[PDB]
Amino acid sequence: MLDKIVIANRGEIALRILRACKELGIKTVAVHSSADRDLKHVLLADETVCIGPAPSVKSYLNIPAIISAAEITGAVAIHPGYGFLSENANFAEQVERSGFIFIGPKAETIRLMGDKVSAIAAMKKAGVPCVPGSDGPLGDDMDKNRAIAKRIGYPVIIKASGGGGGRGMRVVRGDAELAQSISMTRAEAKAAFSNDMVYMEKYLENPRHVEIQVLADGQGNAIYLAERDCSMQRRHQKVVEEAPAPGITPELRRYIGERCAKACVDIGYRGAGTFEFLFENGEFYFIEMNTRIQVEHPVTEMITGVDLIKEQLRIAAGQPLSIKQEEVHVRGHAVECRINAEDPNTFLPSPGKITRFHAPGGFGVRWESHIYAGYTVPPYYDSMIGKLICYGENRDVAIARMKNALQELIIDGIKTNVDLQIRIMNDENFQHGGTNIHYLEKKLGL
Amino acid sequence: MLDKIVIANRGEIALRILRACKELGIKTVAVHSSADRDLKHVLLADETVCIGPAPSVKSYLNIPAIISAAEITGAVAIHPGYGFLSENANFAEQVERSGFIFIGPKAETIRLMGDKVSAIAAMKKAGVPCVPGSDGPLGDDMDKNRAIAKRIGYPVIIKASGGGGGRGMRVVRGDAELAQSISMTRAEAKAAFSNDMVYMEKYLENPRHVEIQVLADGQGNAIYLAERDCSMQRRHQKVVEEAPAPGITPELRRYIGERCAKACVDIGYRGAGTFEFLFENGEFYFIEMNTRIQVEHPVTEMITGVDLIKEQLRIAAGQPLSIKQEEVHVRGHAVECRINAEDPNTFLPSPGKITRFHAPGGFGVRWESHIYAGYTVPPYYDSMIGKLICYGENRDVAIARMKNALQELIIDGIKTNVDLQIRIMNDENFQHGGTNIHYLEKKLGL
Ligand SMILES: NC[C@@H]1CCN(c2nc3nc(N)ncc3cc2-c2c(Cl)cccc2Cl)C1
Ligand SMILES: NC[C@@H]1CCN(c2nc3nc(N)ncc3cc2-c2c(Cl)cccc2Cl)C1
């Protein structure tokens, strides 16, 4: 087991990682910006280092300051959480070169899967179904670009290979728009990612966003831990996630899960990861892989009993997976509501002092948050302040508990999306299940 | 002679140093991580000290623990091998300040040659031919940077002064890319080396990588021991090295060797060192100097009869070089194949337990490895598990012996590059000789 780790992150995920460390008897080093001195996990950590002033560029993205803190505290490993440096291949490489364990994949694996064209080629080669596409970057030959759109069938979508979070994407519905759409996607990718490489996929009009959790030890063993439906979203921000996905049979789960586990073996994957799919008319189509733990990991933990952060720490310590595939059982249902310091109607961010705070309780109710009464949500970071996860023996019980938990949750002094989450839980289409990625934008547009 | 030394390394190079020590009657102290208790050299050493847990930051890079092990055993000297702390000037300084001998040059010389800008200025002043370049660091005036690129002539390459292992470097083919290329190379150097200093060179499209071995003692003697060709490489990892370099005449060898030896006298060099050159269209161009023994030192030993590790130990004890320049004769040819625990499709490390092991034998066959049947290759260190070195009276006989030795080498239980090495020895272009630094990536791309 790792003697001591740096938690290279903040907010709810830093606290999540701290708890996993304490359960395993791992010493914690909380690195923080000067604005994050009062984070709950900093106040609970064995040691603390202030790594710079508020802005992330000076603190949480500051590679020399983080490595320096890990050196002076005698830590042996760094957990990057999600966001910040978690998919920064140069960071992973520097951590290993400075003689630390990186709690995540090999740097070369982060590079492979962070380049969307090379990632799709690897997945297609492994037997993972992908979206009908260019299967390679687009050139400047518009005869060949039109021939790819024709074979695929309009509508199509142009994506940046260095792209992500929905930025650097353009839908094309006929030939007249194709040349200008490719040119503009290139220019946007070059200006943002210093990488003008683009590819083409068939555009699916009304898919669900369904993702497969994996764990691999990097020693030849890989398992899948069912799927999450992340379709309830607004402007490429997930709002509700659930596990398992409604309408997914055991035979479908097994089909796509086995192809994801086999892909992990083929690419030498190490640690926690997520395969993202479009799911439409009963078919899965790979779009991209997250090479890190994700925000919504708790819904998978509730339905499998697997602690994904502890597994990340065991794998990083060099332990092979102890869990075999035949020991992974989907049981019951879990829903996660993201709690954001933003206006429930305008989504204007709402940093500020929380003047009153009460967390929900009950059977099947899990609260993941650093916030407390008197804590100031700072203006410098993300709006996501907490995650409310409710489990039941079925989806209806999970939703019933979430409605009750949302009604107990008090956060005064800032705006939150708690009232939006209550509306979503009361929505008849959500209660039926299986709504598509466009549903929440449509409901709010009315 | 040195009574007792610490071997501040692991794996094959630790065993290589242990043998040199035993031949000279030097007592050995094997410092090891808790994962390396069963290394062959640890089991053969006179004394052992466990200096910390598996991760390199707390063991092989742990300066206090290594010096403390030298103090508690009564050792007089520390041999740093290659990698880890071998090029760490602060380490060399601390070793000398604590009153131990560092088996290497003066700390000041390590600092001079680790600053690529300062090293090039010293070599150019001494009469060593260098690449046409900025001859100084680039500032933030892009009018001056464009004028330097114009004077050199595109294509050019931007390099970190604190740089290493090909990381950060950017090729620039016109003015449009120059500003962003300089900015990105700086940011990468600052994040990795906390040193944002960069310089510019003419980019040579298809060079060979040719390096000159030197030895200098504290009595004023400096000699060259011919050259190695290190061109057969993939993503800045050497795969095959050979000595001498094919197509290098005795007149060229003498020309560049004499300039390297003279540079050693000018800068007060002491110990083993390597001058790295680009060789293209019959001309040498210095890029950088290694102030350490290197992985590929054995091919130079086979063609000269000189034991480079024993020379390192004699020099540090205050003895003159055991041979003069007129006594150094290139005789025959040697090839080295690096044996790696790596996956053939991902090229990631493939650590794990060796279940069956057989080393090759015969005339001209030299096997440099710590591995044995039942030995576990740990995940925490680099993938290179051995070196197979074959000597013949000519290049054809060296290659023939390597093909035979590769066919006898058994390493079961883990994936290895043995099959790749067999393919390289059967390659018609390699058999002809003189292939450039890009050849192996081109062969594998097909
Ligand atoms: N990580 C998901 C990235 C960002 C959004 N995305 C999508 N790609 C797609 N690619 C094809 N060919 N077809 C449909 C897609 C629909 C989306 C999409 C959108 Cl637009 C909004 C919310 C969620 C998703 Cl998954 C790719
Ligand atoms: N130790 C050698 C560093 C890393 C590789 N290198 C190179 N520098 C160079 N500098 C100029 N002006 N021109 C060409 C160069 C080509 C290389 C190079 C590369 Cl890219 C791959 C493998 C081997 C070598 Cl030598 C510098």
Which structure tokens are listed for A219? 């020693």
Instruction: Tell whether B144 and B255 lie within a shared domain.
Output: no
Indicate which atom in ligand 2 lies nearest the CA of residue B204: 13
What was the experiment behind these coordinates? X-ray
Residue reference for tokens 């395969």 = A275
Of residues B328, B272, B269, B268, the one with CA closest to residue B295 = B272
- Looking at the structure, tell me whether residues A387 and A256 fall in a common domain: yes
What is the Cβ-side half-sphere exposure of residue B81, based on CA atoms within 13 angstroms? Answer: 21
Q: Is A91 strand, coil or helix? A: helix
Find out whether B202 and A72 touch, Cβ atoms under 8 Å.
no
Residues 6+ apart with CB under 8 A from B99: none
Active-site residue identified among A16, A228, A259, A292: A292
* A35 and A18 within one domain: yes
Per DSSP, helices labelled H in A240-331 are: 250-267, 297-304, 308-316
Q: H or E stretch including A199?
A: strand A198-202
Residues 6+ apart with CB under 8 A from B183: none
Contact between residue A100 and residue A79 where contact means Cβ atoms under 8 Å apart: no
Residue B309 in contact with ligand 2 by CB distance below 6 A: no
Instruction: Please tell me the distance from the alpha carbon of residue A169 to that of residue A58, in angstroms, as a whole number.
Output: 30
Residue type at A337?
A: C
Residue B211, token pair as written in the block = 């390096």
* Beta carbon of B302 within 6 Å of any ligand 2 atom: no
What are the respective helix, strand and coil percentages of chain A, to the nearest 5?
A: 35, 30, 35
Determine the Cα–Cα distance for residues B275 and B291; give it in Å rounded to an integer: 9
Q: Which residue has the tokens 């290759």?
A: B377
Specify the 3-state DSSP secondary structure of A72.
Answer: helix
- Nearest CB among B57, B184, B343 relative to A76 is that of B57
Residue B184 phi, psi dihedral angles, 5° rounding:
-70, -40
Residue where a domain terminates, one of A184, A203, A222: A203
* Residue type (1 letter), B122: A
Amino acid at B272: A
Q: How far apart are CA B64 and CA B55, in angstroms?
A: 15
CA A170, CA A181: separation in Å to the nearest integer?
A: 6
Tokens of A4: 């001591």
Q: Is there a single domain that holds both residue A123 and residue A146?
A: no
CATH number, domain of A67, equals 3.40.50.20
Q: Taking each helix axis from N to C terminus, what angle separates B175-193 and A63-72, rounded to the nearest 10 degrees?
A: 10
Nearest CA to ligand 1 atom 14: A204
Q: Do A267 and B346 touch (CB under 8 A)?
A: yes
Q: Are B80 and B8 in contact (CB under 8 A)?
A: yes
Q: Are residues B414 and B433 in the same domain?
A: yes
Q: Compute the Cα dihedral for A231, A434, A419, A399 and give only its sign.
A: negative
Residue environment code for B309-338, b if the CB has 16+ CB neighbours within 10 A, otherwise e: bbbbbbbbbeeebebeeeebebebbbbbbb
CA gap B307, B335 in Å, rounded: 17
- In this complex, which of A74, A101, A106 lies closest to B348 when CB atoms are compared? A106
Q: Which of A442, A413, A416, A419 is nearest to A429 (CA)?
A: A442
* Distance (Å, whole) CA B39 – CA A408: 60
For residue A292, indicate whether it is catalytic: yes
Whether residues B357 and B221 share a domain: the answer is yes
Nearest of B41, B40, B84 to residue B376 by alpha carbon? B40
Contact predicate A326/A254, CB 8 Å = no
Cis, peptide link before residue A53, omega less than 30° from 0: no
Q: Residue A429 belongs to what H/E stretch? A: helix A428-432
Q: Residues B259, B275: contact at Cβ < 8 Å? A: no
The ligand 2 atom nearest the CA atom of B288:
1
Nearest CA in chain B to A76: B55
Is residue B128 within 8 A of residue B263, CB to CB? The reply is yes
B158, B174, B203 - which closes a domain: B203
Residues A153 and A268 in one domain: no
> Token match 């090029």: residue?
B87
- Count CB-CB contacts under 10 A for residue A259: 19
- Closest Cβ–Cβ partner in B61, B188, B346 for A268: B346
The helix or strand, by DSSP H or E, that contains position A227, with its residue range, turns out to be strand A222-229
* Ligand approaching nearest to the C-alpha of B239: 2
Do B342 and B243 share a structural domain?
A: yes
Q: Of B355, B372, B410, B378, which is closest to residue A219 (Cα–Cα)?
A: B378
Coil, helix or strand at residue A406? helix
Exposed, middle or buried, A165 (CB in 10 Å: 0-12/13-18/19+)? exposed
Sort strands B271-280 and B283-290 into parallel, antiparallel or unpaired.
Answer: antiparallel
Residues in chain B: 446
* Residue numbers in A near B192 (CB within 8 A): 63, 90, 94
> Quick one: which H or E segment has residue A376?
strand A376-377
**Would the CB atoms of A108 and B184 count as touching at under 8 Å?**
no
Burial (CB < 10 A; 0-12, 13-18, 19+), residue A121, is middle
| Partner residue opposite A194 with nearest CB, options B56, B184, B194 | B184
Q: Which atom of ligand 2 is nearest to the CA of B209?
A: 25
B222 in the same domain as B199: no
B229 C-alpha to center of ligand 2: Å? 13
Residues A390 and A242 in one domain: yes
Helix (H) or strand (E) holding A125: helix A116-126
Could you tell me the CA-to-CA distances from A51 to A29, A45, A58, A86, A377 in Å, in that order? 12, 15, 8, 17, 19
Count of the separate structural domains present in chain B: 3
Which residue CA neighbors atom 23 of ligand 1 most closely?
A437
Q: Label each residue of chain B as H, E or C.
A: CCCEEEECCCHHHHHHHHHHHHHCCCEEEEEEEHHHCCCHHHHHCCEEEEEECCCHHHCCCCHHHHHHHHHHHCCCEEECCCCCCCCCHHHHHHHHHCCCEECCCCHHHHHHHHCHHHHHHHHHHHCCCECCECCCCCCCCHHHHHHHHHHHCCCEEEEECCCCCCCCCEEECCHHHHHHHHHHHHHHHHHHHCCCCEEEEECCCCCEEEEEEEEECCCCCEEEEEEEECCCEECCEECEEEECCCCCCHHHHHHHHHHHHHHHHHHCCCEEEEEEEEEECCEEEEEEEECCCCCCHHHHHHHHCCCHHHHHHHHHHCCCCCCCHHHCCCCCEEEEEEEECECCCCCCECCEECCEEECCCCCCEEEEECCCCCCEECCCCCCEEEEEEEEECCHHHHHHHHHHHHHHCEEECCCCCHHHHHHHHCCHHHHHCCCCCCHHHHHHHC
CA atoms within 13 A of residue B111's CA, in its CB half-sphere = 8
- Strands A27-33 and A4-7: what pairing? parallel
Range of the domain at B26: 1-85
Sign of the dihedral through C-alpha A302, A304, A307, A309:
negative
For residues A11 and A380, what is the distance between their CA atoms, to the nearest angstrom? Answer: 12
Say if CB A27 and CB A46 are below 8 A apart.
Answer: yes
Q: Which helix (H) or strand (E) holds A13?
A: helix A11-23
Backbone angles phi, psi at B183, to 5 degrees: -55, -45
Round to the nearest angstrom and report the end-to-end CA distance of chain B.
54
Own/partner pairs, A93-97, CB within 8 angstroms, 24+ separation: A93/B167, A94/A63, A94/A67, A94/B191, A94/B192, A95/A67
State the Cα–Cα distance between residues B246 and B228, nearest whole angstrom. Answer: 9
| Strand B233-234, strand B237-238: pairing | antiparallel
Place of tokens 């260019």: A134
- Looking at beta carbons, which residues of chain A come within 8 Å of B348? 106, 108-109, 218, 268
**Helix/strand/coil (H/E/C) assignment for every residue in B188-240:** HHHHHHCCCCEEEEECCCCCEEEEEEEEECCCCCEEEEEEEECCCEECCEECE
Closest to A265 in 3D by CA, of A161, A122, A130: A122
Report whether B6 contacts B75 (CB < 8 A). yes
Contacts of A141 (CB under 8 A, 6+ apart): none
Residue A29: strand pairing partners:
A6, A47
| Helix/strand/coil for A80 | coil
* Residues A15 and A372: beta-carbon distance below 8 Å: no
CA A210 – CA A129 distance, rounded (Å): 14
B58 to A71: CB separation less than 8 angstroms, yes or no: no
Give the integer Cα–Cα distance in Å for B339 and A256: 37
Residue closest to A127 by CA, chosen among A248, A284, A242: A284
> Which residue bears the tokens 């640690």?
A271
Residues B108 and B136 in one domain: no
Q: Is the dihedral of CA B14, B16, B17, B19 positive or negative?
A: positive
Contact B346 A70 (CB under 8 A): no
Q: How many helices (H) and strands (E) does chain A have?
A: 15, 22
Q: How far is CA B145 from the centre of its chain?
A: 32
Q: Given A176, A203, A230, which residue is the final one in a domain?
A: A203
Tell me, what DSSP letter sits at residue A194? S
Distance CA B356, CA B370 (A): 14
Same domain (yes/no): A181, A227: no
- Could you tell me whether strands B208-216 and B222-229 are parallel, antiparallel, or unpaired per DSSP bridges? antiparallel
Tokens standing for residue B444: 């594998």
B132 vs B12: CA distance, rounded Å? 38
Query: Any idea what the Cα angle at residue A308 is, between residues A330 and A303, rounded to 5°?
Result: 20
Strand partners, A388: A337, A367
Chain B residues with a Cβ under 8 Å from any Cβ in chain A: 53-61, 167, 180, 184, 188, 190-192, 194, 343, 345-352, 378-380
Q: Do B348 and A74 touch (CB under 8 A)?
A: no
Token pair, residue B309, equals 């590790």
Residues A332-368 as b or e (16 or more Cβ within 10 Å = b): bbbbbbbbbbbbbeebebbeeebeebebbeeebbbbb
Evaluated on CA atoms A394, A397, A399, A405, the torsion sign reads negative
Q: What are the backbone angles phi and psi of residue B390, rounded to the nearest 5°?
A: -125, 130
B369 pairs with which residues across the strands? B386
Closest by CA to A99, choosing from B438, B380, B442, is B380
CATH number at residue B337: 3.30.470.20
Q: How far is CA A421 from CA A335, A399, A402, A445, B155, in A?
A: 11, 11, 9, 16, 57
Q: Which residues does chain B have within 8 Å of residue A90's beta carbon, measured at their own beta carbons?
A: 188, 191-192
Longest pairwise C-alpha distance within chain A: 63
Query: Is-contact A43 A37, C-beta < 8 A?
Result: no
